[PDB]
Amino acid sequence: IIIATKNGKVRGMQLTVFGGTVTAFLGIPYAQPPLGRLRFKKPQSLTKWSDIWNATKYANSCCQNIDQSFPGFHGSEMWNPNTDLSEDCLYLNVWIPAPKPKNATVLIWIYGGGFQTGTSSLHVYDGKFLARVERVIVVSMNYRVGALGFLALPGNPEAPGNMGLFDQQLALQWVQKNIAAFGGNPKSVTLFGESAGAASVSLHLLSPGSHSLFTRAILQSGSFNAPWAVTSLYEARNRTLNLAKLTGCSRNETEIIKCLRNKDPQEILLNEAFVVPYGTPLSVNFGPTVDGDFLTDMPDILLELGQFKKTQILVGVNKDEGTAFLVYGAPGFSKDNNSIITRKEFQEGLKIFFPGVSEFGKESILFHYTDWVQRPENYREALGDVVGDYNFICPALEFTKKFSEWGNNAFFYYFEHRSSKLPWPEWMGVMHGYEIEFVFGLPLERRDYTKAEEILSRSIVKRWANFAKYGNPQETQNQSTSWPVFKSTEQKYLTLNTESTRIMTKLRAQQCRFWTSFFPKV
Numbered sequence: 001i002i003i004a005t006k007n008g009k010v011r012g013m014q015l016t017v018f019g020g021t022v023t024a025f026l027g028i029p030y031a032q033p034p035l036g037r038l039r040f041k042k043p044q045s046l047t048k049w050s051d052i053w054n055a056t057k058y059a060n061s062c063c064q065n066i067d068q069s070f071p072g073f074h075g076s077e078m079w080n081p082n083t084d085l086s087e088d089c090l091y092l093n094v095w096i097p098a099p100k101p102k103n104a105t106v107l108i109w110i111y112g113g114g115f116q117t118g119t120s121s122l123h124v125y126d127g128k129f130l131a132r133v134e135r136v137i138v139v140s141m142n143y144r145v146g147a148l149g150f151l152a153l154p155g156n157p158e159a160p161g162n163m164g165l166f167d168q169q170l171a172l173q174w175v176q177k178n179i180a181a182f183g184g185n186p187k188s189v190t191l192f193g194e195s196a197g198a199a200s201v202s203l204h205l206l207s208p209g210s211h212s213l214f215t216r217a218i219l220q221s222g223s224f225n226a227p228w229a230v231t232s233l234y235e236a237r238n239r240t241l242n243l244a245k246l247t248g249c250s251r252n253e254t255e256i257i258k259c260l261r262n263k264d265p266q267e268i269l270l271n272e273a274f275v276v277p278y279g280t281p282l283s284v285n286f287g288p289t290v291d292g293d294f295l296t297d298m299p300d301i302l303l304e305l306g307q308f309k310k311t312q313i314l315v316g317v318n319k320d321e322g323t324a325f326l327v328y329g330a331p332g333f334s335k336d337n338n339s340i341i342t343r344k345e346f347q348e349g350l351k352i353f354f355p356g357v358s359e360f361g362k363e364s365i366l367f368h369y370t371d372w373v374q375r376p377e378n379y380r381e382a383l384g385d386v387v388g389d390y391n392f393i394c395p396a397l398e399f400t401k402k403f404s405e406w407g408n409n410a411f412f413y414y415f416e417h418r419s420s421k422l423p424w425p426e427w428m429g430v431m432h433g434y435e436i437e438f439v440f441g442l443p444l445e446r447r448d449y450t451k452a453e454e455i456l457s458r459s460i461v462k463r464w465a466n467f468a469k470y471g472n473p474q475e476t477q478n479q480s481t482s483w484p485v486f487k488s489t490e491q492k493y494l495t496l497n498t499e500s501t502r503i504m505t506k507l508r509a510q511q512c513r514f515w516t517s518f519f520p521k522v
């Protein structure tokens, strides 16, 4: 099975999926390896090749630090790179239905990982199920992360910033120019990602350069207005310099880059952590910045004034977004016990999560979240909601409200099902990132999940697919709850779970008024 692309021929492999077949093209190059003098620069167009490129295995993941907090634990290790790390990592994957489709909708996945980690080869991002079940074409790409992908020196082409975002864009471009050859429809491309990947999707909605590279967007647990999604020019500058010093590269700013371009990836990765005086468990040392190229102004401004691609969006969050981060720094927390903490530990926890916040700012948080409705887990649960509400839920709801105010249909979901196979303890509930396997349809594979989860996954997959193809996330055949549009006034949203799916209104009303209106002032 050979497909001819604009840059050359590529060979794929046949896969057996649910008594059927899916054709996968794993590891297709989409840009010149960003090596040597190209390190830190925007992705360069790839050179036309001769012969057949064998896209039969996942390519190298981009250089990144790994989570070493729980060696041997699947809960954390499932997110670590499952492919060799390398600077030569600009590759993408394509899963197409078999027999070859004629004009299928294309789903392009953008993985999360705080812009510091991640890779498209993870088991939970396997797109062969979606290709099989919904007959859509699934594409995913590897983009540079950490300093290698976001080191910023605004205005300087040697390290302009947002390189990772531009890698993604170049991948979207590749789909535009090549997907037709795989039987895909370049006019029907839906982007979807989670966390930092969702924030990336939201930024593409704002970048004029990406406007004509996709049709619709899906944002799972993330958006650019999340406090961890955009690095300020001030912080970027101070971090670029701190990195320079830690590697003995302090100098002319262009000479600094030349210096850093002689350093080994390991030395650069090793010092990324200390660039920030007091970082938090979210740890976005090097992220998106207003570069004047990909992002022409502060995103908050563009959003507020309706400057973005006009189209439909599907947005959502998980019930317990914050828990996952409590075991990476919060005192009294552990994945090995019920983590019943005290008021004192809670207060210390806020310290960990809001390092540069005034003493009054932290008290305002405690005041809002401690008016107990006694229960030994009051503080444990409060800190999780605090982290979740502040970092994900409220920013996602605000993004949705603002985006829809400009006339486009928007759909919001509240994911509240805890995977029966979740390796983490129960007190962590419906964790951040664990709706992904349902979106990708892993529960459809009976070899593994309860019957209820197969049904829930099958439904979500259909809704996501209908949204991509028709801009409407409905499940029209099995007498399913209709998903109402999200509007600024009523603010209806759909709950996803195995029990009963409901239509609710104004998610976290009181909590978000706190984070969206008050807190930004402290």
Ligand SMILES: *[C@@H]1O[C@H](CO[C@@H]2O[C@@H](C)[C@@H](O)[C@@H](O)[C@@H]2O)[C@@H](O[C@@H]2O[C@H](CO)[C@@H](O)[C@H](O)[C@H]2NC(C)=O)[C@H](O)[C@H]1NC(C)=O
Pocket: 234, 235, 238, 239, 241, 242, 243, 245, 246, 274, 275, 276, 277
């Ligand atoms: C901007 O960076 C400075 C410098 O950070 C220090 O040097 C870096 C190379 C790295 O090694 C960091 O871990 C160091 O902290 C920050 O200033 C530091 O502030 C802390 C406050 O706790 C102080 O203990 C350090 O001595 C200061 N560093 C020195 C020696 O000047 C500064 O806070 C950063 N600016 C921002 C964004 O707040």
Ligand SMILES: *[C@@H]1O[C@H](CO[C@@H]2O[C@@H](C)[C@@H](O)[C@@H](O)[C@@H]2O)[C@@H](O[C@@H]2O[C@H](CO)[C@@H](O)[C@H](O)[C@H]2NC(C)=O)[C@H](O)[C@H]1NC(C)=O
Pocket: 330, 331, 332, 333, 334, 336, 337, 338, 339, 340
């Ligand atoms: C839950 O565990 C935390 C973390 O303690 C570590 O992991 C435990 C499972 C066990 O292996 C301990 O020996 C480890 O130290 C406990 O928090 C610690 O509590 C002690 C005393 O309260 C304190 O001195 C430590 O600094 C704490 N560690 C941290 C990182 O905060 C916690 O007490 C346990 N919860 C329960 C079951 O009460």
Ligand SMILES: *[C@@H]1O[C@H](CO)[C@@H](O)[C@H](O)[C@H]1NC(C)=O
Pocket: 054
């Ligand atoms: C690609 O696969 C073909 C046959 O499977 C093989 O002959 C060729 O050497 C491969 N190309 C490589 C390894 O670069």
Ligand SMILES: *[C@@H]1O[C@H](CO)[C@@H](O)[C@H](O)[C@H]1NC(C)=O
Pocket: 102, 103, 185, 187, 188
């Ligand atoms: C795919 O559909 C588009 C409209 O969505 C149409 O313009 C295009 O010609 C189709 N591609 C094919 C099968 O030629």
Ligand SMILES: [Cl-]
Pocket: 479, 480, 481, 500, 501
């Ligand atoms: Cl239902």
